[PDB]
């Protein structure tokens, strides 16, 4: 059995963003039955990696900075439009009159996960530049544990702004154009490496190279092309650990 972790509340069987085809692709290329190990939080997935209780994990860029240090091996990173990188985007409603990050002072704000770069840490980094924290900058904050629920909260006026994954913003705009069309990007983070795929510290060199071959060749296999459509990405390319140095920089400055 091949244990694959995700930090996501999206079902693999979801009509719109169901990533079941990714699991089917891994089954075909490994010859192993895939077991999905789904958790709400990044912390839970990183603990499973630390304790060598899974084989393969889809983790966030901040999670990767920690996971690298307890021996998680990088497999691949998604590429969209030639770019294996992404950024945090700060989103408001176009009709809000809130047109910049400064205009979100004393407003209600949404984060995703305490360990999310694009959903939390990137914005903590922007506020260091004006010598503030979220707690002293915004009227209130909240963790949604969902980029899509953060988007829906901005759309509904529940919060005035949210920080989300540039790639989820892109995929949301394709699937749910009604949410996006009402929304504007008022601020963006610096560029960082895209969320990487890793294998556990314990997986064999044989199995690693097999999984690395499978991800880097996914765009060449018909079932792989189907899996890339469910993930809204062009292909997987090799990880460059240097592409997460901005996150290591912010981390050092809490």
Residue 71 CA from chain centroid, whole number? 20
Task: Say if CB 239 and CB 74 are below 8 A apart.
Answer: yes
Calpha distance 163→122 (Å, rounded): 8
Alpha-carbon distance of 90 to 109, in angstroms, equals 10
Q: Could you give the CA distance from residue 79 to residue 237 in angstroms, rounded to a whole number?
A: 7
- Residue 126: closest CA among 112, 137, 142: 137
In the chain, the domains with their CATH numbers are: 2-80+195-251 (3.40.190.10), 88-189 (3.40.190.10)
Q: What is the C-alpha to C-alpha distance for residues 94 and 81, in angstroms, rounded to an integer? A: 26
Q: What is the resolution of this structure in A?
A: 1.9
Contact 34, 53 (CB under 8 A): no
Q: Do 131 and 81 contact (CB within 8 A), yes or no?
A: no
Q: How many other CB atoms sit within 10 Å of the CB of residue 52?
A: 14
Assign 3-state DSSP to the chain and report helix, strand, coil percentages, each to 5: 45, 20, 35
For the stretch 21-30, what's the b/e string if a residue is b when 16 or more beta carbons lie within 10 angstroms of its beta carbon? bbbbbbeebb
The end-to-end CA distance of the chain, in Å, is 39
Reading the block at residue 134, the tokens are: 């979220």
Q: CB-based burial of residue 71 (10 Å sphere; 0-12 exposed, 13-18 middle, 19+ buried)? A: middle
């Amino acid at each position: 059995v091949f244990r694959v972790a995700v930090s996501s509340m999206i079902s693999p069987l979801e009509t719109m963003k169901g990533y079941g085809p990714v699991l089917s692709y891994i089954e075909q290329q490994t010859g192993r039955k895939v077991e999905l190990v789904q958790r709400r939080t990044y912390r839970e997935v990183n603990e499973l990696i630390r304790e060598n209780k899974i084989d393969l994990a889809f983790i966030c860029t901040y999670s990767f900075v920690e996971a690298e240090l307890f021996g998680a091996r990088p497999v691949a990173v998604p590429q969209v439009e030639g770019n294996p990188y992404y950024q945090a985007v700060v989103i408001t409603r176009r009709d809000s009159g809130i047109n910049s990050l400064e205009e979100l002072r004393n407003k209600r704000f949404a984060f995703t996960d305490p360990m999310s770069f694009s959903g939390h840490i990137a914005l903590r980094g922007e506020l260091v530049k004006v010598d503030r924290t979220p707690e002293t900058f915004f009227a209130s904050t909240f963790y949604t544990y969902s980029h899509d629920n953060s988007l829906r909260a901005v759309y509904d006026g529940i919060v005035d702004g949210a920080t989300i994954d540039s790639l989820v913003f892109r995929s949301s705009n394709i699937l749910y154009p009604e949410i996006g069309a009402a929304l504007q990007v008022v601020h963006v983070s610096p560029l960082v490496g895209a969320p990487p795929v890793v294998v556990s510290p314990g997986l064999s060199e044989e199995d690693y190279q097999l999984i690395r071959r499978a991800f880097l060749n996914m765009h060449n296999e018909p079932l792989g092309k189907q899996a890339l459509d469910t993930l809204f990405i062009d292909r997987f390319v090799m990880v460059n650990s240097g592409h997460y140095d901005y996150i290591r920089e912010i981390a050092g400055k809490i």
